[PDB]
Amino acid sequence: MRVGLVGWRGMVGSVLMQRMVEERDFDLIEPVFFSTSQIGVPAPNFGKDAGMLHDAFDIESLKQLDAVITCQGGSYTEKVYPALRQAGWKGYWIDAASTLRMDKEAIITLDPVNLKQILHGIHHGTKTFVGGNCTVSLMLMALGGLYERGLVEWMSAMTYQAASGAGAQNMRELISQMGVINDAVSSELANPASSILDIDKKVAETMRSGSFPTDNFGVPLAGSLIPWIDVKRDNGQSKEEWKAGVEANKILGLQDSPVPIDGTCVRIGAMRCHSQALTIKLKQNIPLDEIEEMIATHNDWVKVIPNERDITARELTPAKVTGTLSVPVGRLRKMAMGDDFLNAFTVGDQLLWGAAEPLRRTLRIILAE
Amino acid sequence: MRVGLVGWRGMVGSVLMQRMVEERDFDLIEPVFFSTSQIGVPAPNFGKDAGMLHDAFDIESLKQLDAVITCQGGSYTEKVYPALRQAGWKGYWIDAASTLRMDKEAIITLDPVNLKQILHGIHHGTKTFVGGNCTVSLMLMALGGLYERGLVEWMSAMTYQAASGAGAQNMRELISQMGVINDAVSSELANPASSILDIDKKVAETMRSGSFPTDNFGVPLAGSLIPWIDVKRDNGQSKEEWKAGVEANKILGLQDSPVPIDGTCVRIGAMRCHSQALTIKLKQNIPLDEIEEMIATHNDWVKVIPNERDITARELTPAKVTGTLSVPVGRLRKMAMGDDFLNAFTVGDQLLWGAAEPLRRTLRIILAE
């Protein structure tokens, strides 16, 4: 199989390349590397020679491929995808971008949750497979066991989203902001006799100053939070908030009778893990033990953490999860509202299950069929 | 009125002192400053001479006071309060600590919500007045207009709690951790062409290292979060999560038919403002405009932030709110679950309405009555 790679040098693409090397995906394909900047020079060698860099915008070149995996983003997909399909290309388009998620000819791919749907699509002529929104994918990796059994009546999701969701430049800005905050008080910070209110005064002033680095976020992130992600929609949701309901229900094949999913999506000062605090309304009163089993046995990556302070502090955090494929879920308990209300808190890596991992897995599924 | 001040040198105490100076509270009282480790040293001069620092554990000296305002904490109250009351002291005990909050003889004070309850207490022999949990006070300052009208069926609260809530050393530690994170990658950040994954790897290693300053939190906070605050309770709640239900219903005088309040309390890398993401179940489908009016008209400090992207990012954040008495609430909209589900996101300063402000206001109410 001849597989084109686009956006392999960017953040998501570089994670994908790392994972494809780790899993020896390249052993099974003929990789063709494309560039949006410079062509004709040697392609990256991740273990074997792959020839030259090809023109990412050349329709004839793309037409010769059996598949494309693109992490290049929405602008690229919009520019290339329609023309490529119009030109008669029937190969597999595997895409990280949101562009095609809700297209009638596309399947959103999260195989631990919807392998059956993916396989049906492959067998019946679906050629476009799109990774879902990071928060959606991470939530379903945590709660797939409940959703697959049709037990969720509705879910409120309040999120704690990392800088990586916005981009590499945003991550850099977050760290720079952290440095500027510390710089303001570093001389007196470690002196317990120094006025804590004077320290706070300087921190607040620094964060409010015009020179505080906020080009990417627009406002401070370090030391703060931003309770709005992406553009406004007419009903008052942000696009980030709206994505959950439409995408999860497409993944789950419930568009005719969707699970209402809503809440507030908040950016916080984390690098690359999204966390989510969930109010889950269940259709029945299920014992907590059974809920724990349903969740834990759904997939190999979900990890149900005992509901205890010390273990939670150590295991259920971005510090623990960053750069791993593990999806811990904890604080699992019935709520004051009733035995059909379930609290959950989950953490997941935005770049792995939330971006790169479903792309390589989809490739492997297509190969095996 | 002779008023004793205990724990005035600490963080909440320092904020209280600043506020009492700003509002000229000292003009109305005879302040007597107490101490644990500086007995005999001249008392602070905030405008007038207050003599010398008295012994905070001497019951005989405390008995000469008409009132005590204590920011000293739970262990101090546990030791001094029973002994002082048993000695026959009939003065006013105004306390920030959680200790006496649920005692039958005590009133939880948040006068923009329960002035009437406080006044009735004063006129009927109540001599113990206790500030509520920071999260409870801040939530009710935002949503008092709905709660006082009995329109809330239940509420799920997912919190984003500032470092200051854990203590002054914890806030310092947060800033310290920010510095350590930046230090690890400062060279790479200054280079435009550095790899984001290399930067990410170093940040994660730094956060996980024994050298990372985690003495107070036990785990990283900067770059992370901690979805557990305070001790575990038998039903799986943390103490922090349990406080909202018992305290809010006491404040509102709803013990006979309490509003269910529950959720997950999470520590994040914010300086001194708590933020809360609320799923509010209403007993009726109230028009959104009317909800906003009910919220806005409740008190002088709540601020309805229009549900627009740019204004939300600028106004509904710790960076905006820090060190002010403003309690913005925004993202006000009906949710996917139905028009009797209200989303709300609110931010409030932990040290003001969440700690010091109800104490000085209670003093002023007692003085005026």
Side-chain angles (χ1 to χ4, degrees), chain B residues 5 11 15 17 21 25 36 75 92 114 117 124 148 150 176 180 187 201 206 214 217 237 241 272-273 283 303 316 339:
Chain B
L5 294 315
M11 187 173 55
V15 175
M17 294 308 101
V21 167
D25 294 339
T36 306
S75 63
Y92 294 93
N114 73 342
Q117 191 183 69
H124 293 268
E148 285 200 40
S176 291
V180 176
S187 267
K201 182 181 183 65
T206 298
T214 62
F217 286 111
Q237 285 181 309
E241 296 155 356
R272 63 174 274 181
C273 295
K283 295 187 182 183
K303 202 184 187 194
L316 198 63
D339 287 341

Short mmCIF file of all heavy atoms in Angstrom, two decimals, chain B residues 5 11 15 17 21 25 36 75 92 114 117 124 148 150 176 180 187 201 206 214 217 237 241 272-273 283 303 316 339:
data_model
loop_
_atom_site.label_atom_id
_atom_site.label_comp_id
_atom_site.label_asym_id
_atom_site.label_seq_id
_atom_site.Cartn_x
_atom_site.Cartn_y
_atom_site.Cartn_z
N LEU B 5 -7.78 40.87 67.64
CA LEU B 5 -7.42 40.37 66.32
C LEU B 5 -6.42 39.23 66.45
O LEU B 5 -5.34 39.40 67.02
CB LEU B 5 -6.84 41.48 65.43
CG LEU B 5 -7.69 42.68 64.95
CD1 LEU B 5 -9.07 42.26 64.47
CD2 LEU B 5 -7.80 43.76 66.02
N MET B 11 -1.92 35.31 55.85
CA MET B 11 -2.37 35.78 54.54
C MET B 11 -3.80 36.34 54.55
O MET B 11 -4.02 37.46 54.10
CB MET B 11 -2.23 34.70 53.47
CG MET B 11 -2.54 35.20 52.07
SD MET B 11 -2.21 34.04 50.74
CE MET B 11 -3.17 32.63 51.29
N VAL B 15 -4.97 40.42 54.40
CA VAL B 15 -6.05 40.93 53.54
C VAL B 15 -7.10 41.64 54.40
O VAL B 15 -7.53 42.75 54.07
CB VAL B 15 -6.69 39.81 52.69
CG1 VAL B 15 -7.88 40.34 51.89
CG2 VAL B 15 -5.67 39.20 51.74
N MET B 17 -6.60 43.01 57.35
CA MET B 17 -5.99 44.26 57.82
C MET B 17 -6.06 45.35 56.75
O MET B 17 -6.44 46.49 57.04
CB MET B 17 -4.53 44.04 58.26
CG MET B 17 -4.35 43.17 59.50
SD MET B 17 -5.32 43.66 60.95
CE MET B 17 -6.66 42.48 60.88
N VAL B 21 -8.27 48.86 57.02
CA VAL B 21 -7.63 50.17 56.82
C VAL B 21 -8.34 50.95 55.72
O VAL B 21 -8.66 52.13 55.90
CB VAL B 21 -6.13 50.02 56.50
CG1 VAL B 21 -5.54 51.33 55.97
CG2 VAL B 21 -5.36 49.56 57.72
N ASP B 25 -12.25 50.88 59.32
CA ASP B 25 -12.91 50.11 60.37
C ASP B 25 -12.28 50.36 61.74
O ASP B 25 -12.97 50.30 62.76
CB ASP B 25 -12.85 48.60 60.07
CG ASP B 25 -13.65 48.20 58.84
OD1 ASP B 25 -14.56 48.95 58.42
OD2 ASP B 25 -13.37 47.12 58.30
N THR B 36 1.06 34.68 68.85
CA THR B 36 1.55 33.40 69.35
C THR B 36 3.04 33.49 69.70
O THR B 36 3.46 33.02 70.77
CB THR B 36 1.33 32.26 68.33
OG1 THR B 36 -0.05 32.21 67.95
CG2 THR B 36 1.73 30.91 68.92
N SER B 75 -7.28 24.74 64.33
CA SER B 75 -6.65 24.24 65.55
C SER B 75 -6.68 25.26 66.69
O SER B 75 -6.82 24.90 67.85
CB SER B 75 -5.23 23.75 65.29
OG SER B 75 -4.39 24.81 64.86
N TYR B 92 -18.56 38.50 71.07
CA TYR B 92 -18.77 38.03 69.70
C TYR B 92 -17.53 37.35 69.13
O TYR B 92 -16.45 37.95 69.08
CB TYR B 92 -19.23 39.17 68.79
CG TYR B 92 -20.60 39.72 69.14
CD1 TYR B 92 -20.74 40.80 70.01
CD2 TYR B 92 -21.75 39.14 68.61
CE1 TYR B 92 -21.99 41.30 70.33
CE2 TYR B 92 -23.01 39.63 68.92
CZ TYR B 92 -23.12 40.71 69.78
OH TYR B 92 -24.37 41.20 70.10
N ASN B 114 -27.69 36.50 53.51
CA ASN B 114 -28.45 36.22 54.74
C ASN B 114 -28.42 37.29 55.84
O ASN B 114 -28.47 36.96 57.03
CB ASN B 114 -28.06 34.83 55.31
CG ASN B 114 -26.68 34.81 55.94
OD1 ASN B 114 -25.84 35.68 55.70
ND2 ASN B 114 -26.44 33.80 56.77
N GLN B 117 -31.04 36.75 58.51
CA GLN B 117 -30.68 35.67 59.42
C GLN B 117 -29.67 36.15 60.47
O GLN B 117 -29.80 35.82 61.65
CB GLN B 117 -30.10 34.48 58.64
CG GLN B 117 -29.93 33.20 59.44
CD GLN B 117 -29.29 32.08 58.62
OE1 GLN B 117 -28.11 32.15 58.27
NE2 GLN B 117 -30.07 31.05 58.32
N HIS B 124 -31.28 38.01 69.07
CA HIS B 124 -31.77 36.88 69.87
C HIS B 124 -30.69 36.08 70.57
O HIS B 124 -30.90 34.91 70.91
CB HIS B 124 -32.70 36.00 69.04
CG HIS B 124 -34.00 36.69 68.67
ND1 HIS B 124 -35.11 36.59 69.43
CD2 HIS B 124 -34.33 37.52 67.60
CE1 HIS B 124 -36.10 37.31 68.87
NE2 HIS B 124 -35.62 37.88 67.75
N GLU B 148 -32.24 32.43 46.43
CA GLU B 148 -33.16 33.11 47.35
C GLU B 148 -34.61 33.07 46.88
O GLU B 148 -35.54 33.23 47.68
CB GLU B 148 -32.72 34.55 47.61
CG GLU B 148 -31.52 34.67 48.53
CD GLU B 148 -31.39 36.04 49.17
OE1 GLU B 148 -32.43 36.62 49.55
OE2 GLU B 148 -30.26 36.53 49.30
N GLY B 150 -35.72 30.33 45.49
CA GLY B 150 -36.03 28.90 45.58
C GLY B 150 -36.19 28.23 44.23
O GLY B 150 -36.99 27.30 44.09
N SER B 176 6.97 29.24 42.28
CA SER B 176 8.26 28.56 42.24
C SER B 176 8.29 27.51 41.13
O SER B 176 9.23 27.46 40.33
CB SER B 176 8.58 27.91 43.58
OG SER B 176 8.84 28.89 44.57
N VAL B 180 10.68 27.01 37.72
CA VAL B 180 11.46 25.79 37.48
C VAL B 180 11.13 25.22 36.09
O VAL B 180 12.03 24.80 35.36
CB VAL B 180 11.25 24.75 38.60
CG1 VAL B 180 11.97 23.45 38.30
CG2 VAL B 180 11.74 25.32 39.93
N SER B 187 16.39 28.28 27.21
CA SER B 187 17.26 28.31 26.03
C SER B 187 16.51 27.92 24.76
O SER B 187 16.63 28.59 23.72
CB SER B 187 18.46 27.37 26.21
OG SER B 187 19.57 28.05 26.75
N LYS B 201 9.14 17.21 26.35
CA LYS B 201 9.83 16.13 27.05
C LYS B 201 10.57 16.67 28.29
O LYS B 201 10.46 16.09 29.37
CB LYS B 201 10.80 15.41 26.11
CG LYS B 201 11.55 14.24 26.73
CD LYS B 201 12.50 13.60 25.73
CE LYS B 201 13.21 12.38 26.31
NZ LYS B 201 12.25 11.28 26.61
N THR B 206 11.14 17.56 34.12
CA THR B 206 11.35 18.53 35.18
C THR B 206 10.26 18.44 36.24
O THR B 206 10.56 18.39 37.44
CB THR B 206 11.43 19.96 34.60
OG1 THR B 206 12.54 20.03 33.70
CG2 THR B 206 11.62 20.99 35.70
N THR B 214 7.79 20.50 45.44
CA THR B 214 6.43 20.02 45.71
C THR B 214 6.18 19.77 47.20
O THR B 214 5.26 19.03 47.55
CB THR B 214 6.10 18.73 44.92
OG1 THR B 214 6.99 17.68 45.32
CG2 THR B 214 6.24 18.95 43.41
N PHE B 217 2.30 20.96 48.09
CA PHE B 217 1.23 20.26 47.37
C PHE B 217 1.41 18.75 47.35
O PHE B 217 0.43 18.01 47.26
CB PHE B 217 1.08 20.80 45.93
CG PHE B 217 0.43 22.16 45.85
CD1 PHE B 217 1.17 23.27 45.47
CD2 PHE B 217 -0.92 22.32 46.17
CE1 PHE B 217 0.58 24.53 45.40
CE2 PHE B 217 -1.51 23.57 46.10
CZ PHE B 217 -0.77 24.67 45.72
N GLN B 237 -17.09 11.51 48.67
CA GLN B 237 -16.81 12.94 48.55
C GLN B 237 -15.53 13.29 49.30
O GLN B 237 -15.17 12.61 50.26
CB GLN B 237 -17.94 13.77 49.15
CG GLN B 237 -19.21 13.85 48.33
CD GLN B 237 -20.26 14.72 49.00
OE1 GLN B 237 -20.58 14.53 50.17
NE2 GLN B 237 -20.81 15.68 48.25
N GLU B 241 -15.96 19.07 48.79
CA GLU B 241 -17.16 18.84 47.97
C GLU B 241 -18.42 18.76 48.83
O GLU B 241 -19.50 19.13 48.39
CB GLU B 241 -16.99 17.58 47.13
CG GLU B 241 -15.86 17.70 46.12
CD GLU B 241 -15.25 16.38 45.70
OE1 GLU B 241 -15.63 15.31 46.22
OE2 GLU B 241 -14.36 16.41 44.82
N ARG B 272 -5.10 33.36 43.13
CA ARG B 272 -5.95 33.63 44.29
C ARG B 272 -7.44 33.84 43.98
O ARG B 272 -8.17 34.42 44.80
CB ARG B 272 -5.41 34.83 45.10
CG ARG B 272 -5.39 36.14 44.34
CD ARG B 272 -4.99 37.29 45.24
NE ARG B 272 -6.12 37.87 45.96
CZ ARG B 272 -6.02 38.90 46.79
NH1 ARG B 272 -4.84 39.48 47.01
NH2 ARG B 272 -7.10 39.37 47.41
N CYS B 273 -7.88 33.37 42.82
CA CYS B 273 -9.30 33.38 42.47
C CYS B 273 -9.79 31.98 42.20
O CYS B 273 -9.11 31.21 41.50
CB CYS B 273 -9.56 34.24 41.23
SG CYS B 273 -9.21 35.99 41.45
N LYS B 283 -36.19 24.76 38.59
CA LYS B 283 -37.51 24.18 38.84
C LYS B 283 -38.53 24.62 37.79
O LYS B 283 -39.62 24.06 37.71
CB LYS B 283 -38.00 24.54 40.24
CG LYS B 283 -37.16 23.95 41.35
CD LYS B 283 -37.79 24.20 42.71
CE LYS B 283 -36.92 23.65 43.82
NZ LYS B 283 -37.60 23.84 45.14
N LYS B 303 -21.60 40.38 38.73
CA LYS B 303 -21.53 41.04 37.44
C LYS B 303 -21.89 40.03 36.36
O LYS B 303 -21.19 39.03 36.17
CB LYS B 303 -20.11 41.57 37.21
CG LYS B 303 -19.99 42.69 36.19
CD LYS B 303 -18.53 43.06 35.97
CE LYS B 303 -18.40 44.29 35.09
NZ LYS B 303 -17.00 44.46 34.61
N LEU B 316 -14.00 37.26 32.44
CA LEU B 316 -14.39 36.11 33.26
C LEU B 316 -13.20 35.21 33.60
O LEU B 316 -13.21 34.01 33.31
CB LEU B 316 -15.50 35.32 32.56
CG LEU B 316 -16.35 34.35 33.38
CD1 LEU B 316 -17.15 35.09 34.45
CD2 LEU B 316 -17.29 33.59 32.45
N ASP B 339 -34.29 23.40 28.54
CA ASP B 339 -34.38 24.80 28.92
C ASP B 339 -34.56 25.02 30.42
O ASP B 339 -34.67 26.16 30.88
CB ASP B 339 -35.45 25.51 28.09
CG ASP B 339 -35.02 25.73 26.64
OD1 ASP B 339 -33.81 25.67 26.36
OD2 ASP B 339 -35.89 25.95 25.78
#
